Design a protein around this ligand. Structure first.
Ligand SMILES: Nc1ncnc2c1ncn2[C@@H]1O[C@H](COP(=O)(O)OP(=O)(O)OP(O)(O)=S)[C@@H](O)[C@H]1O
Ligand SMILES: [Mg+2]
Lengths: 494, 53, 53, 583
DNA sequence: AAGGGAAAATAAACAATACATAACAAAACATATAAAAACCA
DNA sequence: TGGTTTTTATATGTTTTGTTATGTATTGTTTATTTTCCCTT
């Protein structure tokens, strides 16, 4: 053939049609009743989604030990009736019950900081009104999860929504014309109400904001039976992206979920422990396996002030329910490994999770490690920081020339030549120990420890090929660098 | 060195003068024409620079 | 003389010759402009003898 | 949506029905409308047979400057059998325009690809290679009658994929416009192809200026690679003058025996061709054509260079040829020698037959300088083996009589300076059949003082606009036109007398004092129709506002002409002047 | 011929602007393949 | 109708080109002080 200027030998193209839905029935009066039609609304798709359960199955299982603390960690998982979002349940459920019962269309906007129960309680709204629809007090509907961070492209939401509505695989430019003809032209007698959840709406609108307009404008149509529950993080995402006249035309509700208080965290943690706290297990003393009601009848209480200080500390910072369920899951496995080490069960009178297990689980996520990292570096790496801290108090310029650091390291071994530690190390730091190596310009492992501190994130270095005039910041603080160097014995005396 | 034109050859020379002499001293070096109207010519550089520009 | 890279400008993509802001400079060494000046019998060294040499 | 506000619109203009005439040639009737139509169309076709006979030979010459240059570069591109066989033969083309095609040999059991690289095709080193490996892989499938990564691994797989060995030639087009960091790194990249035993590279550098400028740009270890075998080939239209001497001789063959060349014209040709050394031959042809275009457009006696139109001769022709300055010198010579009046009167216009019978005598002389210059140029060529000479300044010194004072510089024509001696004689009526520039048309049309013609029209402006006397007392503003300058011309003399940096407001007031206050307000009121303009004129502030409106469209017109800088944006109060007259 | 004294020059601190390049955007230039669409047959 | 070829829509990759932001270097602006020769005496 022709000689190609470059090759693309890894193109894999999807079998997706190009013609939209507005061109396959030739008339609005020739559109059939779409609810009594086989390939719409997912009436045959329940075979392929259940195919992949058989791939991760294997037949070997040899008596895995399920101890006392393994049952508590299973019950504090986020995947395992919700107490502290009651007015927010009653706002989303009331707005969606009215629009389904009246064959109307609306949009519900819900925002908040991460982890506050909003993806959970929207799914609990639509599960309540699936059960209300299955009892035939509202008509049947179809429910679509759209997650913006579960998409490769932002434009894949058009493909996935129209695939769930119609069972047809089209491209995205053909899917939005298929959906737009579906919502404004197809009559209300032929359609079914659709409750789509646009989850994590921040991620879809970062580049071109053409995607948030379409889902909200489709709900203003008369013939459309579409309820967009749009859950995002910030409250001003509609008004910044769309504008003021567009967000007033749509007329959507606007809910914000405040992060939970410390008393609400206690009624989440202790709600997921009602079946196990203050309860009796059957533990055999030779394997360690516990069984809820050779064997002792042990029992399990968790301390209420341990849940208190796990709630007071988490809710004061962010207030999310994930960080409190995994600070009590982390405390439950700290208590397990000491139970596992005392009796030595391994893997195949009363147990408790103290205040000291929860504090240990909570301190390790709040401590920094840049103190502990820098006290245990080399003498060479600590001499690099100690020379950099002297330069930031001769000038305070907070980005030092790298050749000013080298001359400071040489001056600091110059002046402290009476020191007992510096006399014996300056032979092993300029000639590297023995003779036959000349006295040199950089200290031994200068390229090692400069790259060790850049890789660790402690140190920032600009991009210059002149290795002497290049500039060097810190990235941690001047205080916690000085705190780590006033601990080391040999540097604080010199 | 070059096969430039006779006025291309004086236009690199004038380019080399404009780019290394300073603009402040040009009236003292190049001016030649008599003055009908009263005025003072430029005095020139007072002292030499030891940079060799 | 500019297309032959004997006169330079400030480097912007699509500079306009026809503008107030665009300035010019020469890029030939002294050893080329000395060979040029002796061809047209112009004594360029006297213009630079009085500045330092 | 007007078309004046659009960019690039197309008019399909309306042509009238028929203008009753076959008069569609651009030549006009001369002698202020006394020349017949048959003379105008004869002077048109006698122009085109003298114009086309000149360009049939110049097109023949230009086709020989490339056929010689293709063959001179091909003697030098081939057969330099080196015994070391681990380098490239480099061809430096000194002063070459990059418009020469290079034909490679056919020469089977070998591929000969030519790879040409312009500096626009060379932004960096990988773009030089991906175009070079595309140009050889595309040109080897063209001769062959799967895809390959375009890199220098195509050079090692060339025998293992095509069966014949390679000989690639690189032709760098504008190497004075490429940057030499990239071209240095690409020659070093091509150096890595000397381990493959079946390839040979050949570089060709079209150095427009100089070799000494190139070796100061490349690194020193690259020049040591370029010196195993290099060849400097001087390629110019201006070398030895041998192609400028052929176009000027081709011109003198067309106008041999029918037009003369004044030495004021020839040294203008000789001076303007020295100011452009790179493209002489197009500029030599441009000046000979525009002077030949100028002759047949302006002289009614252009039809009198073929002898068949001499039998046409008219009375207004007889009134205009007798003011030739040689013809008065001939009548002066007949006064001073022969006393009686009648033979001079038979020469003059009172004998109606004799003067037109006097002009038919002197048209048939050969006027032999055109053949003698070709005689000298051929004789001075083959006898003395002299190459480096203009035929243009040989023809210029021959018109004066300074021939042997030009030949003494070669110091070998002393035995031949008496046999080549020629003093020209002034033939009669030679001013009517000649090419000269004493009016200043060629140095106004082809080589104008561009900016000096702009400041002279701005400053003077009386040479431009007609100062008319009758028609102004009828019109609306002719009481104002004698007392007020055009605003671009008035503002320019305030511009000219000012210093470098000038305040706009002080330049506005100094403009305003030049204007007449009473007659501008009389002119602004002399239209009774505009009510909105008469309302401005009743205001006490009328002259101060009309002067500012009229100022700041001329201070605007001086910026896009380029006469004024607005110094120091954010300030907009003072301007710097860009342009001085006379420079 | 002397000399006054204003133009010109020098220097130094400071402010304002230009410049070289980094980072990127976007249009021209280029290829690939499934779906439409002609189109013989 | 039916297979086959051709075009289009969708999708991504490549190279050139033009815009903008910014840190640093250059250049203008003002004020004090010293040298130079023109224009009055
Ligand atoms: N009120 C609650 N009652 C019980 N469990 C809760 C409650 N809120 C959150 N959880 C648990 O914590 C998890 C947090 O999920 P969500 O908070 O709904 O996610 P989220 O609000 O979308 O946070 P994102 O995705 O970062 S915006 C849920 O899956 C539950 O397991
Ligand atoms: Mg969520």
């Amino acid at each position: 053939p022709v000689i190609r200027k470059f090759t693309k030998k890894n193109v894999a193209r999807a079998k997706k049609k190009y013609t939209p839905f507005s061109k396959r029935f030739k008339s609005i009066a020739a559109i059939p009743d779409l609810t009594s039609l086989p390939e719409f609304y997912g009436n045959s798709s329940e075979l392929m989604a259940s195919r992949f359960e058989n791939k991760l199955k294997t037949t070997q299982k040899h008596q895995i030990v399920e101890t006392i603390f393994s049952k508590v960690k299973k019950q504090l998982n986020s995947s395992y009736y919700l107490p502290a979002r009651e007015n927010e349940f009653a706002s989303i459920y009331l707005s969606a019950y009215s629009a389904i019962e009246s064959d109307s269309a609306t949009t519900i906007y819900v925002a908040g900081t991460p982890g506050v129960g909003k993806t959970l309680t929207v799914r609990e709204v639509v599960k309540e009104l699936l059960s209300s629809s299955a009892q035939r007090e509202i008509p049947d509907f179809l429910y679509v999860e759209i997650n913006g961070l579960k998409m490769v492209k932002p434009t894949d939401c058009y493909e996935t929504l129209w695939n769930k509505v119609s069972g047809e695989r089209l491209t995205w430019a053909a899917s939005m014309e298929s959906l737009e003809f579906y919502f404004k032209r197809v009559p209300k007698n032929k359609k079914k109400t659709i409750v789509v959840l646009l989850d994590e709406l921040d991620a879809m609108v970062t580049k071109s904001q053409d995607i948030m307009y379409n889902f909200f404008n489709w709900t203003t149509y008369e013939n459309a039976k579409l309820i967009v529950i749009a859950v995002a993080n910030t409250m001003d995402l509609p008004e910044r992206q769309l504008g003021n006249k567009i967000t007033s035309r749509i007329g959507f509700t606007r809910i914000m979920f405040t992060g939970y208080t410390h008393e609400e965290l206690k009624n989440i943690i202790d709600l997921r422990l009602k079946g196990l706290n203050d309860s009796f297990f059957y533990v055999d003393t030779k394997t360690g396996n516990a069984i809820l009601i050779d064997v002792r009848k042990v029992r399990l209480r968790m301390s209420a002030d341990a849940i208190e200080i796990a709630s007071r500390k988490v809710a004061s910072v962010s207030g999310d329910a994930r960080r409190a369920l995994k600070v009590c899951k982390r405390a439950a496995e700290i208590a397990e490994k000491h139970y596992m080490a005392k009796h030595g069960y391994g893997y195949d009178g009363v147990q408790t999770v103290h205040i000291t297990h929860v504090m240990k689980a909570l301190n390790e996520t709040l401590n920094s490690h840049v103190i502990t990292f820098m006290t245990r570096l080399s003498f060479t790496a600590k001499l690099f920081i100690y020379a950099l801290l002297n330069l930031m108090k001769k000038n305070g310029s907070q980005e030092q020339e790298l050749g000013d650091i080298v001359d400071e390291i040489k001056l600091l071994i110059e002046v402290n030549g009476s020191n007992k530690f510096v006399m014996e190390i300056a032979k092993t730091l300029f000639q590297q120990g023995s003779d036959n190596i000349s006295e040199q310009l950089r200290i031994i492992s200068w390229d090692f420890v400069l790259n060790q501190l850049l890789d660790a994130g402690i140190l920032f270095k600009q991009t210059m090929k002149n290795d002497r005039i290049c500039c060097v910041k810190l990235n941690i603080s001047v205080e916690e660098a000085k705190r780590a160097m006033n601990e080391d014995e040999t540097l604080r005396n010199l | 060195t070059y096969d430039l034109s006779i006025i291309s050859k004086y236009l690199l020379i004038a380019s080399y003068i404009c780019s290394y002499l300073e603009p402040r001293y040009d009236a003292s070096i190049f001016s030649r024409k008599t003055r009908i109207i009263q005025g003072r010519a430029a005095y020139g550089r007072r002292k030499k620079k030891e940079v060799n520009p | 003389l500019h297309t032959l890279k004997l006169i330079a400008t400030t480097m912007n993509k699509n500079i306009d010759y026809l503008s107030p802001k665009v300035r010019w400079k020469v890029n030939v060494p002294w050893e080329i402009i000395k060979e040029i000046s002796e061809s047209v019998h112009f004594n360029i060294s006297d213009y630079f003898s009085d500045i330092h040499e | 949506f007007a078309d004046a506000q659009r960019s690039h619109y197309t008019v399909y203009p309306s042509l009238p029905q028929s203008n009753k005439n076959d008069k569609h040639i651009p030549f006009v009737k001369l002698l202020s409308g006394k020349e017949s139509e048959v003379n105008v169309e004869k002077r048109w076709e006698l122009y085109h047979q003298l114009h086309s006979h000149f360009h049939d030979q110049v097109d023949h010459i230009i086709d020989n400057i490339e056929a010689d240059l293709k063959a001179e570069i091909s003697d030098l591109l081939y057969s330099e059998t080196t015994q070391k066989r681990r380098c490239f033969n480099t061809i430096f083309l000194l002063g070459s325009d990059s418009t020469t095609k290079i034909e490679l040999k056919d020469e089977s059991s070998r591929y000969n690809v030519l790879i040409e690289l312009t500096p626009k095709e060379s932004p960096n080193v990988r773009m030089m290679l991906r175009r070079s490996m595309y140009k050889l892989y595309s040109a080897a499938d063209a001769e062959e009658h799967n895809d390959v990564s375009y890199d220098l691994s195509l050079v090692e797989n060339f025998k293992r994929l095509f069966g014949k060995d390679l000989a690639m030639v690189f032709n760098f087009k504008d190497v004075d416009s490429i940057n030499f960091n990239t071209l240095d790194n690409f020659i070093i990249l091509l150096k890595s192809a000397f381990k493959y035993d079946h390839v040979k590279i050949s570089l060709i550098f079209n150095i427009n200026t100089n070799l000494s400028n190139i070796e100061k740009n490349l690194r020193q270890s690259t020049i040591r690679l370029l010196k195993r075998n290099y060849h400097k080939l001087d390629v110019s239209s201006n070398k030895g003058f041998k192609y400028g001497n052929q176009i000027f001789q081709s011109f003198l063959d067309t106008v041999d025996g029918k037009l003369n060349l004044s030495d004021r014209f020839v040294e203008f040709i000789l001076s303007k061709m020295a100011n452009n050394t790179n493209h002489n031959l197009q500029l030599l042809t441009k000046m000979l054509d525009y002077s030949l275009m100028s002759y047949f457009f302006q002289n009614a006696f252009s039809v009198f260079i073929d002898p068949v139109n001499v039998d046409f001769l008219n009375d207004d022709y007889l009134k205009i040829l007798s003011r030739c300055p040689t013809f008065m010198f001939f009548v002066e010579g007949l006064i001073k020698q022969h006393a009686p009046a009648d033979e001079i009167l038979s020469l003059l216009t009172n004998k109606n037959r004799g003067l037109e019978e006097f002009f038919v005598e002197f048209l048939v002389r050969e006027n032999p300088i055109n053949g003698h210059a070709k005689f000298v140029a051929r004789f001075l060529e083959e006898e003395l083996n002299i190459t480096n000479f203009n035929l243009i300044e040989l023809y210029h010194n021959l018109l004066i009589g300074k021939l042997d004072s030009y030949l003494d510089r070669w110091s070998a024509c002393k035995e031949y300076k008496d046999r080549l001696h020629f003093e020209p004689i002034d033939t009669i009526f030679q001013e009517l059949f000649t090419l000269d520039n004493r009016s200043g048309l060629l140095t106004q049309s082809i080589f104008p003082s561009y900016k000096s013609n702009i400041e002279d029209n701005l400053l003077s402006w009386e040479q431009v606009l007609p100062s008319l006397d009758k028609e102004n007392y009828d019109t609306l503003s002719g009481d104002l036109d004698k007392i007020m300058a055009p605003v671009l011309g008035q503002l320019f003399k305030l511009y000219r007398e000012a210093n470098m940096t000038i305040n706009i407001y002080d330049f506005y007031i100094a403009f305003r004092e030049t204007l007449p206050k009473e007659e501008i307000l009389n002119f602004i009121r002399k239209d009774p129709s505009n009510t909105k303009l008469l309302e401005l004129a009743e205001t006490p502030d009328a002259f101060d506002k009309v002067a500012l409106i009229l100022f700041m469209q001329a201070i605007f017109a001086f910026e896009n002409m380029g006469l004024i800088k607005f110094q120091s944006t954010k300030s907009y109060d003072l301007v710097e002047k860009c342009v001085w007259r006379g420079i």
